[PDB]
Amino acid sequence: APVKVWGSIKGLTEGLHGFHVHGAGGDLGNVTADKDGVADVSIEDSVISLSGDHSIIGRTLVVHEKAGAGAGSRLASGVIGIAQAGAGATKAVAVLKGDGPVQGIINFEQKE
């Protein structure tokens, strides 16, 4: 089942920011921060999973603080933690923390 990935990250520079789960199979894409430094996230991803031998639970989620595809970026990061779910679903949450104002909350959900 696809994993739904959603939430927001704040305190970013305007533009495109690389958005990855650490390790294999983790290149989620990018988030786009507006003129206020706020990036809304709403992604569906059928490559990642919240269960099985390649579950992303306990892996680190990162966002590049440097905008664009350039080198030498610092990261905001947080560990993907288990959240309590209702029947037939798995849920997880990563609390991202970086430098200065960079912070966010990203939710993950997958039907069981």
UniProtKB/Swiss-Prot annotation:
**N6-succinyllysine PTM positions:** K35, K66, K91, K97
| Reactions the enzyme catalyzes | 2 superoxide + 2 H(+) = H2O2 + O2
Say which domain of life the source belongs to: Eukaryota
Q: What is its EC number?
A: 1.15.1.1
| Covalent cross-link (1-(tryptophan-3-yl)-tryptophan (Trp-Trp) (interchain with W-33)), residues | W6
Cofactor(s) the protein requires to work:
Cu cation; Zn(2+)
The entry's stated outcome for H20R is: In ALS1; 80% of wild-type activity; ubiquitinated by RNF19A
What happens to this protein after translation, modification-wise?
The ditryptophan cross-link at Trp-6 is responsible for the non-disulfide-linked homodimerization. Such modification might only occur in extreme conditions and additional experimental evidence is required.
The places in or outside the cell where this protein is found are:
Cytoplasm; Nucleus
Q: Which UniProt keywords apply?
A: Acetylation, Amyotrophic lateral sclerosis, Antioxidant, Copper, Cytoplasm, Disease variant, Disulfide bond, Lipoprotein, Metal-binding, Neurodegeneration, Nucleus, Oxidoreductase, Palmitate, Phosphoprotein, Ubl conjugation, Zinc
The record lists the effect of K66A as: Decreased succinylation
Carrying N-acetylalanine, the residues are A89
Lipidated residues (S-palmitoyl cysteine): A94
Residues annotated as carrying N6-acetyllysine in the record are K66
Its biological purpose: Destroys radicals which are normally produced within the cells and which are toxic to biological systems.
Q: Report the disease annotation for this entry.
A: Amyotrophic lateral sclerosis 1: A neurodegenerative disorder affecting upper motor neurons in the brain and lower motor neurons in the brain stem and spinal cord, resulting in fatal paralysis. Sensory abnormalities are absent. The pathologic hallmarks of the disease include pallor of the corticospinal tract due to loss of motor neurons, presence of ubiquitin-positive inclusions within surviving motor neurons, and deposition of pathologic aggregates. The etiology of amyotrophic lateral sclerosis is likely to be multifactorial, involving both genetic and environmental factors.
Family statement drawn from the similarity comment of this UniProt entry = Belongs to the Cu-Zn superoxide dismutase family.
- Protein name as it appears in the record: Superoxide dismutase [Cu-Zn]
- Species: Homo sapiens
Q: Which gene encodes it?
A: SOD1
